[PDB]
Design a protein around this nucleic acid. Structure first.
Ligand SMILES: Cc1cn([C@@H]2C[C@H](O)[C@@H](COP(=O)(O)O)O2)c(=O)[nH]c1=O
Ligand SMILES: [Ca+2]
Ligand SMILES: [Ca+2]
Length: 341
DNA sequence: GGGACCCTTCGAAT
DNA sequence: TTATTCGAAGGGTCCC
């Protein structure tokens, strides 16, 4: 298998630059403003000129502004970035039948039947990069390797505006030398759990007792990391099918009053049904984020599709269950629909 | 013993 | 200290 992975560079911020070219060279911060106080909310992403100084995805807006008070702060315009993404994803379809769109700005292409070797793959990556640049003026990073995991690792290493092949012998080097925290799917909690077993590199997973590894991080993650360490990972590139669609909203103030929470929940349902389009869900979950930021959910699978009317009434039940079963005030209320017909 | 869901939480990715 | 989606962990049921 040959996998070519594309990751659009600092995506939301770059789309803003493309639509306002006077922003190029300046720090640009894309923000999710939450409307509870002046500048409440979080940074969705920032360009490399903002990241240079510590302003990055996930930090509070208030903190970003203490670091770079004079950077450009822009509200998130998801709909705009989605349309650009869709167009660039359509460009990528010209280069392979087998394309897995992992997210708004990530796509895996199985190019096994389009290129013979890693050189031809590299040239195809450049072609791809040149094509997106010419059509949309967007720079992307290409990672090329023997599976989806190392193709992604390749892009993580080359970004921004990069292109990198990790050949079969470099895969083997990285199994020993790559810090295991840089493996896709290993975040802070798993990385720390792996350190407390002395596992720093993929290769280290092959000497620990499986049950011990499985005990700490779970069966699937253990099996995942081990298959990688054995150089035996080769998950197929597959068309992703949306399996759920939902909407969650921050309320202006935290609360546990049904009547006060209702309109927010109902707006969330309305937005979700719009996004669902012609899809008909058999499952519904009401999701509450509590005042201390924990997530609590209650749901129900119906034997048949859920009409909006049924969603409205069923969601009130599930919300009451949350209020009943959890003493905490709710900060965020939401709904997710799944198990589509 | 294990299929076939189902429910809620956790952890990770964008 | 945002929003969105995914997959799996464990808890469970009921069922051959
Ligand atoms: C926190 C956060 C990150 N991202 C992504 C994931 C990475 O942190 C970062 C990668 O995208 P970027 O580097 O193209 O901006 O932004 C979002 O799209 N939304 C979010 O809310
Ligand atoms: Ca990106
Ligand atoms: Ca990591």
């Amino acid at each position: 298998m040959i996998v070519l992975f594309v990751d659009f560079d600092y995506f939301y911020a770059q789309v803003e630059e493309v639509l306002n070219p006077s922003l190029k060279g300046k720090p640009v911060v894309v923000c999710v403003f939450s409307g509870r106080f002046e500048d409440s909310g979080a940074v969705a992403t920032a360009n490399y000129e903002a990241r240079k100084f510590g302003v990055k995805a996930g930090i509070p807006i208030v903190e970003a502004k203490k670091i770079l008070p004079n950077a450009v702060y822009l509200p998130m315009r998801k709909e705009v970035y989605q349309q650009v993404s869709s167009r660039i994803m359509n460009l990528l379809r010209e280069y392979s039948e087998k394309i897995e769109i992992a997210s708004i700005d990530e796509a895996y292409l199985d190019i096994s039947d389009k290129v013979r070797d890693y050189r031809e793959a590299y040239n195809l990556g450049l072609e791809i990069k040149n094509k997106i640049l010419e059509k949309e003026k967007i720079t992307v990073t290409v990672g090329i390797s023997k599976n989806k995991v190392f193709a992604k690792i390749a892009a993580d290493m080359a970004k921004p505006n990069g292109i990198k092949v990790i050949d079969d012998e470099e895969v083997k080097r990285l199994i020993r030398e790559l810090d295991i925290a840089d493996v896709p799917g290993i975040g802070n909690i798993t990385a720390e759990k792996l350190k407390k077993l002395g596992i720093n590199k993929l290769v280290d997973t092959l000497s620990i007792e499986f049950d011990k590894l499985k005990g700490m991080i779970g069966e699937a993650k253990a099996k995942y990391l081990i298959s990688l360490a054995r150089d035996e990972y080769n998950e197929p590139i597959r068309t992703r099918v949306r399996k759920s669609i939902g909407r969650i909203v921050t309320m202006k103030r935290n609360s546990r009053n049904l009547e006060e929470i209702k309109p927010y929940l109902f707006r969330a349902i309305e937005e979700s049904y719009y996004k669902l389009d012609k899809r008909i869900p058999k499952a519904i979950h009401v999701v509450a984020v509590t005042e201390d930021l924990d997530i609590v959910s209650r749901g129900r699978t119906f034997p048949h599709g859920i009409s909006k009317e049924t969603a409205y009434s069923e969601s009130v039940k599930l919300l009451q269950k949350i209020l009943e079963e959890d003493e905490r005030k709710i900060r965020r209320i939401g709904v997710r629909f799944s198990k589509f017909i």
